[PDB]
Amino acid sequence: KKVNWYVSCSPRSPEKIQPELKVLANFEGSYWKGVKGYKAQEAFAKELAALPQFLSTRDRVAPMKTYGFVFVDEEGYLRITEAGKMLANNRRPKDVFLKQLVKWQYPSFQHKGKEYPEEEWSINPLVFVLSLLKKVGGLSKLDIAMFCLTATNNNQVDEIAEEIMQFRNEREKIKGQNKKLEFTENYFFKRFEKIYSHKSKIETKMRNARDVADATTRYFRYTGLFVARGNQLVLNPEKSDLIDEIISSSKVVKNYTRVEEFHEYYGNPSLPQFSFETKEQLLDLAHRIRDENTRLAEQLVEHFPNVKVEIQVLEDIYNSLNKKVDVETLKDVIYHAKELQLELKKKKLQADFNDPRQLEEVIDLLEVYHEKKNVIEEKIKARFIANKNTVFEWLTWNGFIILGNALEYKNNFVIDEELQPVTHAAGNQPAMEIIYEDFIVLGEVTTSKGATQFKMESEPVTRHYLNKKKELEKQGVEKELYCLFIAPEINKNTFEEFMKYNIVQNTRIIPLSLKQFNMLLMVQKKLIEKGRRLSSYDIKNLMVSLYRTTIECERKYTQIKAGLEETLNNWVVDKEVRF
């Protein structure tokens, strides 16, 4: 028997399921089971690796089964559930996840019989964590790896809440931040020992837990039910009504041993049906969010006219309802309108940033990346669920939000409903794309150094830029394209290589040290103190200048290097603030 439930790491973040599932849907109706199925699994594996997204079958497909996107009918054919179809078509993907993860239970068709007896097992894991959080405050990745994976029954909420509360109480006693880690780590080894070389073996289970707890946080956050506060998973205050209804109507259905019958329920993305899902109530919910958005916008359009973008998009979303007023159209309007709200929140950060303490938090946090590896990991884990690399992307992006005037601040790393970081940008994408009135600036960041940096950033960066420019041409968008490449320490060979690309291949890649990126932030801080702020033109100008310097200066590493410092300081001084 098993004693933990798990969220697979294939992939670690949910948004990567969609492209694989889209490819898998093409094998619907293929023989899939045993030896007669080899030809299809083989053809799939292969058409799958051909994605830009990837440049063993049973291991990738398993999560898709587990979340009831797909199954194998009794006579051996691959089937795609209604939920799978919707996700493959990219229809309201986070709602599809929310509803599947809410119905997720043990036992199930995947996890039944011998290894999963009903004496031990009866749990909806997502809804467990929702109930559990109603008691405890939030749960770090380690809480979850420690305590939650091992829970096998919805009944164990209180027992497990209590036991966590005590672990917090026995840890408050241990003085020394160093000594607290020992206590925690030893408690971890012991608790798992009760439950599962002796020494090296339990440690490997503890490793596995920490991995699976990361994935868990990422999947649960993608639902919009949970968010991050600091390094703690907690409930989303905007979803209280829903979470309630979810806890109330939850259940472990007993009919899980026959594949067709089980998936008729578990594959159904309309289930569970919630109380507000009527035409009447969906209209109210659609209107309600329009009001929230109109409001947010209206409080911001004086100081920050770049919100006219969102305003126009809302008009476009809602205009559907002049054509159709059915349940389905309403759900799409509501989904899109919440995405658009999330865009509005990115623009509201612009306003939050008129507060020097808020602006300074980003500066100060960015500063941390000057410190040594060990101090980096420490101040991060204490403040964020996502790892340091992903947080650097997050922070830089906030930097561009500080500087203002973009029509869109397009993070390519994943964030949650409270704009907190989750997952880094995919290999085929820059970390962010900042879209202005008449130019576009890509953000490429890294924390890697020396020979390693060249390895890792040279080709990706130039390729992203060249791919992006191709796409603008294709779409006939006629804005200049720059790329700011930001690192705490830029490696000489990396720098020279982008220089080569700028003059030879006509890229506009501008390397700025972290120190230099920060000066921009401080510059904007001081402007705001004096009731002024950077314009779209100021940023354009800075980008044009620094690029000009890259192609016009003598082809000597320290020549260009000081040339950038030169152009930079020109622009700095120009804003007529000293220090």
Place this chain on the structure above:
Amino acid sequence: KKVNWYVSCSPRSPEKIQPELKVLANFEGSYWKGVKGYKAQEAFAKELAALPQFLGAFSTRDRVAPMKTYGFVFVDEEGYLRITEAGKMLANNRRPKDVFLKQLVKWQYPSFQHKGKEYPEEEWSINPLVFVLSLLKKVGGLSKLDIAMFCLTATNNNQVDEIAEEIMQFRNEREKIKGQNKKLEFTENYFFKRFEKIYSHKSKIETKMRNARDVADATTRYFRYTGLFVARGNQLVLNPEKSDLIDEIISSSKVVKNYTRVEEFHEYYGNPSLPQFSFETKEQLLDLAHRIRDENTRLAEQLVEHFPNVKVEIQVLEDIYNSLNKKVDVETLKDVIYHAKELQLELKKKKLQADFNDPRQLEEVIDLLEVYHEKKNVIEEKIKARFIANKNTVFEWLTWNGFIILGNALEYKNNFVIDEELQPVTHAAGNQPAMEIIYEDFIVLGEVTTSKGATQFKMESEPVTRHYLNKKKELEKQGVEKELYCLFIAPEINKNTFEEFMKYNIVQNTRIIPLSLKQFNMLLMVQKKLIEKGRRLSSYDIKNLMVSLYRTTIECERKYTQIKAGLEETLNNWVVDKEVRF
């Protein structure tokens, strides 16, 4: 400016330095530089050629250069030949692997031998052996090829992280490539291009790659000699019994700046006490001595019931440690520790007898021996994938495991070199049999070759008979009264080689017994089946085999095919006698 360091292949194996150095030390205080130097260098070359090792002058500067490179010797400001303290130790044959360990650790570029324009401080600051220690801590093992590709062209101690990085990636690229032949292509291609960036063009980069390979070989031999590294398969790894020493070596190593002036530099480099290690006090040397004792006592105690031939080592340990009843000084302790490790190594040879109770381990030696019936290219390929050593050395090694498996010897004396985990390094010298197996009341020399036909006759007739007659005179001389046999093993025994030994047996009173590889394995097969049944060969059974085969060689009709069939029958008789299933 040079881009690689190097271990000379003169000699390729480090144990051959000692006798040269001993001869060379006789020339201490001789003028050695330039034109007045000619007389001395020539007297030396001549004395050097007199050794058993150069029979079975030329450029000296090449014989002597490694002795300069490792700090055994130098030419002083006035141009006289001087032997450093390390050289003196090694000449006298005191703790020679320790001497080597210390000199190779201190060894650096740049140096007194390797300085100036060819070796600029901008590019060069490396201790080669300590670099490979560091590197291995990251990548686990390094094949010769690895060493050829990545290591010889490192010129700075700080390149470790970088080269580790680069290797892991190369291993990740290679691992994804499907198909053995295509893996080889990529490997050769990566190698080719890498060395192109560093140095008929194609054939010039390939000479460099070949050299790199050869130097990698000598490198692994010298490094293994130190005991710091052992072989696992065809990989050089760190010796896990040496974690602590390795870490201390890494921490305290350095490239000293005072290399330009000869006397000053050698006062450091020729000092066989440097570097001084933490445990090298009387107190901690005592603990180290006691700790090795306990290792030895333990392995001897888990053996002595079923393998009472470990009584030899038990007694020798006693003799070694009883020195400390008389003196406990740092020097006596270093000697005690040195010998007790040597003796530990003997205990491990006796432990193999126990490991071999496991039918799988036994069978591995049979199947490896079995590979030498294949074509030359199959042999090379199957041995390069499993050993650092060449297939000729590995054949001596397997034959010797063959004798361990048959059991009962007081001593299994490999004359070829093995490392601290008993893996093979270097074939036996031309003036020795490959092994000497010593029992209670008889001795068996083992001579083996992979050679065939006229080239086997040419190579073997005279050295085999000469080894036998040298050993026999030496026994008489020492009053050791045991009969002396030799088993001569080859995959295919040449008619003329055979008849030559038969001739020497009956005319010159040798006891040379040539067995085919096939017949050798048949013995091991027999002992295997005896073990399956709770039995095993005794010392008697072995003696009986040797005596009988010998008798057949001198008693049978003097026709080649008669004696050849006589051996088969005697062998089959002894096999039948053992009552096993063939």
